[PDB]
User: Which sequence fits this backbone?
DNA sequence: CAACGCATGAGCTAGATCCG
C-alpha cells in the first residue's frame, strides 16, 4: 500500500509524555509536530516507545528543550519526506538546544520539498558534516548549523555510502556509525530509487519496493487517491492540502462540523477550482447550498454564526466570535457596559452584519447612545418568538437616544411586538418615527409602550421643534430655529443640542456630514402633565476648503534621465480630490563648490507642469544626468470651476549620472622644456556629470615607483594642463584621469615622451 | 451732572418692558446690575431715550443674550464712572454671548480703576473696533478683546464726521447719534471731552468743565473738597481711589442710602471690612467677629446668582447666607468642580443650596461646618435645597460634624441614581424638614435605583516584591451571597507618584476564591527598580434591583527591586597618541539604581612573528566611578589593545555589574620611525661587488615587510632590490652581484606597515670594473 | 520544606508560586 495507516492531526506536547500515546495508529500528521518544555524526565523511558508507522509530515517538525534523548532514531524510524507546507520561523526542521542527543539518527530523509534545516546549541551531536544536504535539501542556501559539538573536530566522525565528492574532498557521508547516507545513481533526481539503482515510478519518491510501479512505492509527489496518485486527479474529487483529492461529500461535512462556532481554528471550507480551499479569496463570496464561490459583484459580505441561538455581547471580546457574521440564524442580545476606546471597535466587529433572524434584546445597555452600528442590518423577521409575543425588547437604556435614521436607512419587520420601557433618553416622537418605516401600523397590532416611561431627562412627548434658518461655512454653522413656548413660558428652562458626525456651534470639519436636532426641557406641574419638543433628525454636511500639502514626497532615480516619485495624499482632502499637479525645476550646480581644493580633506558634499490624476506616483523623463531637480507637488481637489488647491510640497531629485561621460578624450599631449619641466595637456570631457573637480596624472618609468600628482581645477584652469616639475629624462608611462563628482573614469594610454639614450 | 438724582440700591432687569425706565431717576447705584436671558420680549418693544441721570455705579455690569436691543443709550447715555468693590469674572465689565445689537451707548465711559476688560464670545456684535481700548482704560495689552467677531472688524461702523473729536473702524464712536470723546492716548485713563486732550489734566473719565480739577467727576488721586491731592489728609479717608471723606462723612455716605456701606480702615473709607468682621448697625462700622463670620457680603433682594467660575462674591468670607443662590455657570463638563471654584472657603451655608452634574466626587466633605439654615429670606418655592444630576455622588455627610438643622426650607431628592436611599432618609431626619410637616416632594422612582453605597475595602493578605515582579494576595472575600461573586478586578499601574488617580491602570481579573483560598495576583514582567500602585475591587453579580455587594481594596505602592546593570552604552576605545589609548562609553540603558563604578579591564595585544617574515619580493584593570571615560597609557607605537568594559550599580555586598564589552584598538603608528638608521658602510671592489650594510629601523613599527634598496646610476636605468627578512638577516644588509661602471648611489627605506618611512640619504659608492 | 536548577525573561512556545 502507499499509506495504509491513519490520518493524524497536528498536536503540541509540553511538560509530559502522556499525550504522545495518541500516535499508536495514525501515520500521516497534517499540520506540524511541536514537542517542547519537558524537564523532569529520565533518559531511560525513551528506549521502549516507538512509532514505526509515521511517514508524512506536512508543515514542520520542532524539537525544543528535550531532556533524556540521546538518539531519536529509536522514535522516528520510518519518516521520509517533509513537505514543508508551512514554514515555522522560516524553517522546516529545527533541532535546538538538545542536551543529551549523542547522534541525530535521521537516516531516512530523501527530499525536503521546501524550507531548510537548522541545528543549534547542541554540544552532543557528531557526524553533522556527513549529511550531504544538497542531495536532500533542494535549498542549501538557507541551511544554518552552527554552535554544535562539531564546532571543533573532536567527536570522532568515523563510519563505514560512496563517500560523495560534492565538495573538493572525498568526504564520507554517514548518518550514524552503523548507517551511511544512501546515494544511488542520479539518472532520476527525485523519482524514487532502489538499492540496486533501478529508478522506480516517476511520480513517487523516497524508498521503494518494486520499480516503475505507482501502486507499490512509498511516497509520491502531487496528490494521492486510494492507493494510486496522479499529478492531477479527475474531478469527482477536489484537491485538498496540495497532497490529496477527495469527493465533495467529505469536506462539505467539515464546513458543517464547525458551522457551530465551537472552534475558531477551523475554516468554513469552500469549493473553488477543485480545491476545497478554506476561503475563496477577495472578490468572491459564498452561496447557500452549492458551496461554490460567487464572483462577488461589487462589495459583498462574509459569514460566521451565533452561539446556541442566544449570543450575549458584554464587550468587544464577546463580539469577537461575531466577527464577520453576516446572517445570524437565531436571536441576539447586547449588554455593553463600557471599557476603553469604544469609538469604532463596536462598528468594526459588526459593521457588516446583514440579517438577524430571532429577537433582539437591548436589556441593561448603557454604554451606547445609538444603535447606528447595524449599518448593514436590513430586516428582523424573527422565526422564533420571544415569550409574550415580542420581537423587540429594550429596558434600562439611560443614555440611548437615537435608534435608527429613517432617512438614510429602511427597516422592515413582519411579526412580533415591541417593548420600549424605562428608556428616558429615548424619546417618544422617535419611537413614533419607526412605525412608518418598520410598518407595525400595518397588520395593525396593539403594542405596549408606556407614554410616561420615556421622555425623562428630556421633554419631547408633545411638540416637534422646527428649524428656521441654516447657513454653513468651512468651519462653523449657526442654528436658529423657531421658538417653542409651553403654555406656561416660565416652565421652559432651556434647550439642549446634540450633534455627531440661536446658537453658534464652532467645532466642525470640512467635508463632513453631521446629524443635528433640538430638544426642549420643561419642568413638571403638580399633576404629572409634562410638555416639550424634539426637532427632527436633520443632516448637516460641510463644504470643501483647499486640502493640505502632499505628505512625505520621495523621488528616486533609476536611469540617467529618469526620476520616479512617491508621496502621500494630504491629511485633509476636504472633498473629492480630482487630481494632482506636479512642478519640477532644475538646480544646475552649487557655484560655491567651484573654489575648494578637493585633494586636501575629501568631498564637500516658467517651469514645466504635469497633471497626474488619481495616482500617487510620477515617472519623470527627458532629464539631464546628475542634475539636482526641485519638485513641487500640488494636490488639487476641484478643477473645472476655477481650480484651487493647497501649498506646494517641496522635494528634490537627482538623476543617476552616466559613467562614460568622464573619460579624457584623446591622447594627452606632452611638451618637453629644456629645464626638466614638462607640459601635459588634455581636454576636459565634453559632458561632465555635475563637475570634473580633480585630475589624476600618473607618470611612471617602467620598473620604478610611481608618484601621484593632484592637478587641481584651478591649476588646470589657470595654466591649461599641468606643469609637471621634477622629471628626470627618459621615457615614461603616464596615465591621465579626470575625477568628477560621480567617480573615476578610465586611464588614458601611457603618455610616452621619450628621448633616445 | 453733579449727582442730580437720588442714590438707589442694586437692581436687575428681566423679562419685561415696563421696567426699562427706572434709572432715569437714580444717579448713584450701590449694588449689582445685570441684564440677561431676554426672551419674552421682542425687538420692536424696546424704546430709545437719552437722560443725563446716571454718573456712577459701584459694582460690576453684565450682559448675556439680550434679544431685541438696538442701542445702549436707552438706559446708559450718561454713565461716566464705573468701578466696583465686588468683582465678577475678575472684570469690571463682562460682555458674553450677546446678539442682535449693532451699536453701543458708552461714549462717555473712560474711567476704569478696578478690574479689567473682557471682550470675549460676542456674536453679531458691532462697534468693537471703533473703540480705542487705550482711550477707555489702560492700553489693549491688559484687556482680552478676543474670541469675538470684531477681532476682524466686522459690521460697517459709521462714526459722525466721516460731534466726533479727532482720533470697520472709521473713527472712535459708540452710537450713530453720539461720538466717543477721543484724545491722545497719553491720557490713557484720565478721560476727556471732545477737545483732543486730557479733559482737564489729571481727571478720570470725564470732567464737566475742562481745565478745572474741581469739576473732575473722578480723578486719579483722591478728591478732597475741590482738590485731587495725592493722599487724603485727616480726618478725610480714601474713598475708592477717587475721593477723600471724613469718618463722619464716611458714616454719613452710607447712612444716606439707608446699599453699600463704607467704614474707616487703612485710611480707606471704602465699602469693605477686614476678614471675619461682622457688622454693628450703630454707625455701620466694622466690628470684630469670631468663628464662621459672614462679615461684609451683599445679599440684597434676598437672592444672588452664580454663573461664573471666579468672582468676588463667595470668597470674601460670607459664611452665613441670608439670601438665595442659583448656579448657572456656562461652559465646562463638571459643575461639581465649577461649584467648588466659588464656595471653596465657605463651609457653612445658611441659604439656598443645590448641586448639579455630580462628578469627580462621591461624597461631600466641603460642608462640614454647616449646622443651621436660617431661611429668613423665602427661597424659590420655599425650597432651600435641590438635588438633581447626582450621577457620581455615593455618600453624604456624617452626623457628628455636620449636624445641619433647617429652620426654613424644604427638601428635593430627585435624579439621584447612584446614591442609596439610606443617606436620603438621614437627610430628612437631621435637617428635620419631614419633622416640621413641611411639604417635601420626593421622587423615589428615579432615586434609589442604579444605586451603590457599599464601599467595603479589601486588604492584600500576602504580598511579595521581587526584582521584576510582585506577587500580591488579598483575603478571600465573600459577599452576602456566595453565588454573588464574579471574582475580583485588581487595578494596578506603575506610580512612583504618591498622588495618582484611577479615573484616567491595567486591570487583571481573579477567579472567586475556593468555596478556602486567598485570591491574589502576581504581575507578569515589569521594569526592575520601579514603583507600582496596586488595588483590587470585587466584581459581583448585580440583581434587577441593582444592589451592590462588592468590595474595593485600597491602592498599595509596592516596588520591584533592582537587578544587574545594563552594558555601558556605546563603548568606544580610540587612540589618542602613539603611547596612549582612551576608552569612552555612555551610562547604561538600564542603570538599575545608583551607579557605584564602571568595571573596566584592559590588556596588551602583540604582533605575531610570521607577519614580519612575510615578504612580497592579574589583568590590568581600572575602576571608573560614575564616569563615561577611560584613559590608559604606557602603550607602544602601532600596538593593539583590548579593553574590557562593564557598568556596575552595587559593589559593597556583591559584585553586581553589567556583562562585559571589549574594544580592540591600536595606537597610532610612527611613520618616521621606519626611516633607515645606522651607518651605511660600503665595501667597494673592482669586480662589481659592493657589500651593503644598513641597520634595522629605529622602531619595530609592527610587521616589517621588506627593505627597499634602490641602487641607481645617473644615465642608466634604475634597479631596485627587494631585501627580504632572510636576505637582510643573512647578508647583514645586501651585496651587489654584478654591476656597471660609474659612481652609483643607493637610497634605503625599510618597508613596514606602520605608515611608510622616508628614503634615507643616497649613499654613494663608486663602482669600477 | 521552605534562589536555582534540569530555560529564557516579552525576539509561530509558556510568561516568573510559569516549575520543583
Assistant:
Amino acid at each position: 500500500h502507499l499509506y495504509p495507516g491513519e490520518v493524524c492531526p497536528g498536536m503540541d506536547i509540553r511538560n509530559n509524555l502522556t499525550r504522545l500515546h495518541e500516535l499508536e495508529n495514525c501515520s500521516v500528521i497534517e499540520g506540524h509536530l511541536q514537542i517542547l518544555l519537558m524537564f523532569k524526565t529520565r533518559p531511560e523511558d525513551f528506549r521502549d516507545l516507538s512509532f514505526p508507522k509515521l511517514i508524512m509530515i506536512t508543515d514542520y517538525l520542532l524539537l525544543f528543550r528535550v531532556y533524556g534523548l540521546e538518539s531519536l532514531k529509536d522514535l522516528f524510524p520510518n519518516l521520509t519526506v517533509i513537505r514543508g507546507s508551512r514554514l515555522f520561523f522560516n524553517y522546516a526542521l529545527v533541532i535546538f538546544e538538545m542536551v543529551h542527543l549523542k547522534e541525530l539518527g535521521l537516516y531516512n530523509l530523501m527530499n525536503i520539498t521546501r524550507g531548510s534545516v537548522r541545528i543549534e546549541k547542541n554540544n552532543e551531536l557528531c557526524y553533522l558534516a556527513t549529511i550531504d544536504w544538497s542531495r536532500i535539501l533542494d535549498s542549501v542556501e538557507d541551511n544554518h548549523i552552527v554552535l554544535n559539538k562539531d564546532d571543533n573536530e573532536e567527536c570522532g566522525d568515523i563510519c563505514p555510502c560512496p563517500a560523495t565528492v560534492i565538495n573538493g574532498q572525498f568526504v564520507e557521508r554517514c548518518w550514524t556509525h552503523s548507517h551511511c547516507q544512501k546515494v544511488c545513481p542520479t539518472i532520476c533526481k527525485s523519482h524514487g530509487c532502489t538499492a540496486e539503482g533501478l529508478c522506480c515510478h516517476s511520480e513517487c519518491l523516497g524508498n521503494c519496493s518494486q520499480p516503475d510501479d505507482p501502486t507499490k512505492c512509498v511516497a509520491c509527489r502531487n496528490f494521492y487517491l486510494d492507493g494510486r496518485c496522479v499529478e492531477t486527479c479527475p474531478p469527482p474529487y477536489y484537491h485538498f492540502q496540495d497532497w490529496r483529492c477527495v469527493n465533495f461529500s467529505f469536506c462539505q461535512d467539515l464546513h458543517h462540523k464547525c458551522k457551530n462556532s465551537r472552534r475558531q481554528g477551523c475554516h468554513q471550507y469552500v469549493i473553488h477550482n477543485n480545491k476545497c480551499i478554506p476561503e475563496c479569496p477577495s472578490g468572491y463570496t459564498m452561496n447557500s447550498s452549492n458551496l461554490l464561490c460567487t464572483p462577488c459583484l461589487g462589495p459583498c459580505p462574509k459569514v460566521c454564526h451565533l452561539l446556541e441561538g442566544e449570543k450575549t455581547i458584554d464587550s468587544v471580546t464577546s463580539a469577537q466570535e461575531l466577527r464577520g457574521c453576516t446572517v445570524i440564524n437565531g436571536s441576539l442580545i447586547i449588554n455593553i457596559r463600557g471599557g476603553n476606546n469604544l469609538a469604532a471597535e463596536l462598528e468594526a466587529n459588526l459593521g457588516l452584519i446583514e440579517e438577524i433572524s430571532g429577537y433582539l434584546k437591548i436589556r441593561r445597555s448603557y454604554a451606547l447612545v445609538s444603535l447606528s452600528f447595524f449599518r448593514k442590518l436590513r430586516l428582523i423577521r424573527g422565526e422564533t418568538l420571544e415569550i409574550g409575543n415580542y420581537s423587540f425588547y429594550a429596558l434600562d437604556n439611560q443614555n440611548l437616544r437615537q435608534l435608527w435614521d429613517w432617512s438614510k436607512h429602511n427597516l422592515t419587520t413582519t411579526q412580533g411586538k415591541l417593548f420600549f420601557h424605562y428608556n428616558p433618553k429615548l424619546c417618544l416622537s422617535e419611537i413614533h418615527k419607526m412605525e412608518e418605516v418598520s410598518g407595525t401600523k400595518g397588520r395593525q397590532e396593539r403594542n405596549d409602550i408606556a407614554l410616561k416611561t420615556n421622555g425623562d431627562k428630556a421633554s419631547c412627548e408633545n411638540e416637534l421643534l422646527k428649524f428656521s434658518y441654516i447657513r454653513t461655512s468651512f468651519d462653523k454653522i449657526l442654528l436658529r430655529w423657531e421658538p417653542y413656548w409651553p403654555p406656561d413660558f416660565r416652565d421652559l428652562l432651556g434647550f439642549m443640542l446634540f450633534y455627531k458626525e440661536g446658537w453658534l456651534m464652532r467645532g466642525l470639519k470640512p467635508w463632513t456630514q453631521y446629524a443635528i436636532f433640538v430638544k426642549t426641557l420643561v419642568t413638571f406641574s403638580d399633576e404629572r402633565r409634562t410638555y416639550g419638543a424634539k426637532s427632527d433628525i436633520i443632516y448637516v454636511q460641510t463644504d470643501a476648503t483647499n486640502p493640505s500639502v502632499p505628505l512625505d514626497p520621495i523621488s528616486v532615480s533609476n536611469s540617467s534621465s529618469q526620476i520616479i516619485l512617491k508621496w502621500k495624499p494630504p491629511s485633509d482632502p476636504n472633498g473629492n480630490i480630482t487630481h494632482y499637479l506636479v512642478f519640477w525645476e532644475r538646480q544646475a550646480e552649487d557655484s560655491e563648490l567651484f573654489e575648494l581644493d578637493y585633494c586636501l580633506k575629501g568631498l564637500k558634499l516658467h517651469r514645466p507642469f504635469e497633471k497626474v490624476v488619481n495616482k500617487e506616483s510620477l515617472v519623470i523623463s527627458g532629464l539631464r544626468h546628475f542634475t539636482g531637480y526641485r519638485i513641487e507637488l500640488q494636490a488639487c481637489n476641484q478643477d473645472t470651476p476655477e481650480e484651487r488647491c493647497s501649498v506646494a510640497a517641496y522635494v528634490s531629485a537627482r538623476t543617476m549620472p552616466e559613467a562614460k561621460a568622464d573619460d579624457i578624450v584623446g591622447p594627452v599631449t606632452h611638451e618637453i622644456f629644456e629645464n626638466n619641466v614638462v607640459h601635459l595637456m588634455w581636454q576636459e570631457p565634453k559632458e561632465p556629470n555635475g563637475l570634473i573637480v580633480l585630475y589624476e596624472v600618473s607618470y611612471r618609468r617602467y620598473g620604478d615607483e610611481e608618484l601621484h600628482l593632484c592637478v587641481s581645477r584651478k591649476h588646470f584652469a589657470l595654466e591649461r594642463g599641468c606643469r609637471l616639475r621634477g622629471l628626470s629624462p627618459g621615457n615614461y608611462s603616464v596615465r591621465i584621469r579626470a575625477t568628477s563628482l560621480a567617480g573615476n573614469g578610465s586611464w588614458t594610454e601611457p603618455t610616452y615622451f621619450y628621448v633616445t639614450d
In short: Chain A has four helices and 45 strands. Residues 6-151 of chain A form a domain with the 24 nucleotide stem-loop, u2 snrnp hairpin iv. U2 a'; Chain A fold (CATH 3.80.20.20).
